[PDB]
Design an enzyme around this catalytic site. Structure first.
Site, PDB file in Angstrom:
ATOM      1  CG  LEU A  56      33.701 -36.840   8.292  1.00  0.00           C
ATOM      2  CD1 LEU A  56      34.503 -37.604   7.242  1.00  0.00           C
ATOM      3  CD2 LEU A  56      34.559 -36.303   9.469  1.00  0.00           C
ATOM      4  N   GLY A  57      30.212 -33.916   7.168  1.00  0.00           N
ATOM      5  CA  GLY A  57      29.552 -32.804   6.494  1.00  0.00           C
ATOM      6  C   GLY A  57      28.502 -33.251   5.502  1.00  0.00           C
ATOM      7  CD  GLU A  58      23.598 -31.868   6.651  1.00  0.00           C
ATOM      8  OE1 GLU A  58      22.472 -32.103   6.153  1.00  0.00           O
ATOM      9  OE2 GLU A  58      23.817 -31.876   7.884  1.00  0.00           O
ATOM     10  N   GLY A  59      26.136 -32.068   1.795  1.00  0.00           N
ATOM     11  CA  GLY A  59      26.175 -31.288   0.564  1.00  0.00           C
ATOM     12  C   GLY A  59      25.165 -31.724  -0.470  1.00  0.00           C
ATOM     13  CG  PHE A 114      20.082 -34.340  -3.750  1.00  0.00           C
ATOM     14  CD1 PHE A 114      20.044 -33.017  -4.179  1.00  0.00           C
ATOM     15  CD2 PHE A 114      18.882 -35.036  -3.656  1.00  0.00           C
ATOM     16  CE1 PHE A 114      18.832 -32.409  -4.533  1.00  0.00           C
ATOM     17  CE2 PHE A 114      17.670 -34.430  -4.017  1.00  0.00           C
ATOM     18  CZ  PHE A 114      17.651 -33.116  -4.439  1.00  0.00           C
ATOM     19  CG  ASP A 117      29.168 -27.851  -5.267  1.00  0.00           C
ATOM     20  OD1 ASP A 117      28.894 -26.660  -4.979  1.00  0.00           O
ATOM     21  OD2 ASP A 117      29.002 -28.806  -4.475  1.00  0.00           O
TER      22      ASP A 117
HETATM   23  C1  LIG Z   1      39.454 -32.991  11.014  1.00  0.00           C
HETATM   24  N1  LIG Z   1      38.428 -33.076   9.968  1.00  0.00           N
HETATM   25  C2  LIG Z   1      38.463 -33.916   8.861  1.00  0.00           C
HETATM   26  C3  LIG Z   1      37.288 -33.656   8.152  1.00  0.00           C
HETATM   27  C4  LIG Z   1      36.859 -34.236   6.905  1.00  0.00           C
HETATM   28  C5  LIG Z   1      37.565 -35.278   6.340  1.00  0.00           C
HETATM   29  N2  LIG Z   1      37.064 -35.818   5.162  1.00  0.00           N
HETATM   30  N3  LIG Z   1      37.578 -36.866   4.465  1.00  0.00           N
HETATM   31  C6  LIG Z   1      36.701 -37.057   3.424  1.00  0.00           C
HETATM   32  C7  LIG Z   1      35.632 -36.126   3.464  1.00  0.00           C
HETATM   33  C8  LIG Z   1      35.875 -35.315   4.577  1.00  0.00           C
HETATM   34  C9  LIG Z   1      35.265 -34.179   5.201  1.00  0.00           C
HETATM   35  C10 LIG Z   1      34.130 -33.545   4.576  1.00  0.00           C
HETATM   36  C11 LIG Z   1      33.334 -32.500   5.152  1.00  0.00           C
HETATM   37  N4  LIG Z   1      32.368 -32.105   4.288  1.00  0.00           N
HETATM   38  N5  LIG Z   1      32.538 -32.885   3.169  1.00  0.00           N
HETATM   39  C12 LIG Z   1      31.710 -32.671   1.976  1.00  0.00           C
HETATM   40  C13 LIG Z   1      32.329 -31.602   1.076  1.00  0.00           C
HETATM   41  C14 LIG Z   1      33.619 -32.035   0.581  1.00  0.00           C
HETATM   42  N6  LIG Z   1      34.643 -32.382   0.174  1.00  0.00           N
HETATM   43  C15 LIG Z   1      31.321 -34.015   1.289  1.00  0.00           C
HETATM   44  C16 LIG Z   1      29.940 -33.934   1.987  1.00  0.00           C
HETATM   45  C17 LIG Z   1      28.803 -34.246   1.163  1.00  0.00           C
HETATM   46  N7  LIG Z   1      27.880 -34.556   0.541  1.00  0.00           N
HETATM   47  C18 LIG Z   1      30.205 -32.447   2.333  1.00  0.00           C
HETATM   48  C19 LIG Z   1      33.610 -33.764   3.301  1.00  0.00           C
HETATM   49  N8  LIG Z   1      35.725 -33.657   6.335  1.00  0.00           N
HETATM   50  C20 LIG Z   1      36.598 -32.643   8.889  1.00  0.00           C
HETATM   51  N9  LIG Z   1      37.307 -32.294   9.994  1.00  0.00           N
END
Ligand SMILES: Cn1cc(-c2cn3nccc3c(-c3cnn([C@]4(CC#N)C[C@@H](C#N)C4)c3)n2)cn1
Length: 282
Positions: free
Chosen positions: A15-18, A20, A129
């Site tokens: 989903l993503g990084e941040g 640590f 943040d």
């Molecule tokens: C269609 N779609 C849904 C998503 C989606 C859903 N959810 N549900 C919980 C979390 C997420 C994240 C998501 C992305 N980046 N992050 C972070 C920053 C923050 N909030 C947490 C991480 C660290 N460490 C980077 C969370 N992305 C993406 N595209």
């Protein structure tokens, strides 16, 4: 509380990084539910802080704060894994560049961030943040603060936390940059930056690192932070986003007062944004 069995966790996508950590989407299927799982990517300073991070989210109960599901005994990387709700539309940083959203919706999102933030501050915690990348969209009319990786308790007999290469300095007030003191009012400065981002639809060329580096220059040795601090102190600020009302720009600018005590609190911001939302809603 809910111990998610690592065996039933089927990885769907990253989903993503941040800073640590890394968040990933999983199906929790004991036979044949979508959950967001955060894992530590990392030094021993941030490893002891990881348990503190989990305890922070564990005790936050609010409509505009991501829902803590539970944990799982993660052998995969020795340290515990954090299980949360999957917030289906993602971060505002990812969503806003492809979806043209009206001013009215943007101001609602801003009001909801303030409610979640005012709640966080009443729990004696600072975020550190607050940016659009950490704001998640549940649906067109619901937003939640989704990550607490830098969130800290403010020590009881002090009005600030004494604070690295991963610091989001382009979202930081001069006191964080110059005195390494993070106050509850330092989070309001970052909110003003998050509101600018929302109003520019998170357009890359309009981002705070882009805009500030055009003012600083990229050949400044170890002095980007110092150059940022002095321009901020000279009264320079991020420009007015195109089609951002003059009154909303002044609200943003009030969030960016050099003196921390002249900034509004999140409690002060909630009625103001409620009214501004109601005005543009019609
Ligand atoms: C269609 N779609 C849904 C998503 C989606 C859903 N959810 N549900 C919980 C979390 C997420 C994240 C998501 C992305 N980046 N992050 C972070 C920053 C923050 N909030 C947490 C991480 C660290 N460490 C980077 C969370 N992305 C993406 N595209």
């Amino acid at each position: 509380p809910t111990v998610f069995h690592k065996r039933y966790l089927k990885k769907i996508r990253d989903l993503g990084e941040g800073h640590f950590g890394k968040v990933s989407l999983y199906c929790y299927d004991p036979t044949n539910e979508m959950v967001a799982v955060k894992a530590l990517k990392a030094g021993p300073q941030h490893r002891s802080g990881w348990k503190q991070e989990i305890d922070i989210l564990r005790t936050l109960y609010h409509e505009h704060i991501i829902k803590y599901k539970g944990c799982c005994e993660d052998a995969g990387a020795a340290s515990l894994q954090l299980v949360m709700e999957y917030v289906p539309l993602g971060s505002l940083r990812d969503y806003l560049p492809r979806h043209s959203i009206g001013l009215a919706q943007l101001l609602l999102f801003a009001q909801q961030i303030c409610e979640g933030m005012a709640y966080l501050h009443s729990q004696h915690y600072i975020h550190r943040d607050l940016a659009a990348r950490n704001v998640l969209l549940d649906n067109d009319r619901l937003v939640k603060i989704g990550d607490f990786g830098l969130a800290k308790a403010v020590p009881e007999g002090h009005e600030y936390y004494r604070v690295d290469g991963d610091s989001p300095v382009f979202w930081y007030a001069p006191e964080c940059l110059k005195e390494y003191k993070f106050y509850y009012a330092s989070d309001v400065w970052s909110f003003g930056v998050t509101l600018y981002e929302l109003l520019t639809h998170c357009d890359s060329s309009q981002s705070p690192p882009t805009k500030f580096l055009e003012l600083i220059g990229i050949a400044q040795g170890q002095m980007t932070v110092l150059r940022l601090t002095e321009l901020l102190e000279r009264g320079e600020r991020l420009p007015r986003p195109d089609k951002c009302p003059a009154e909303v720009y002044h609200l943003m600018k009030n969030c960016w007062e050099t003196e921390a005590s002249f900034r509004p609190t999140f409690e002060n911001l909630i009625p103001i944004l409620k009214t501004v939302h109601e005005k543009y809603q019609g």
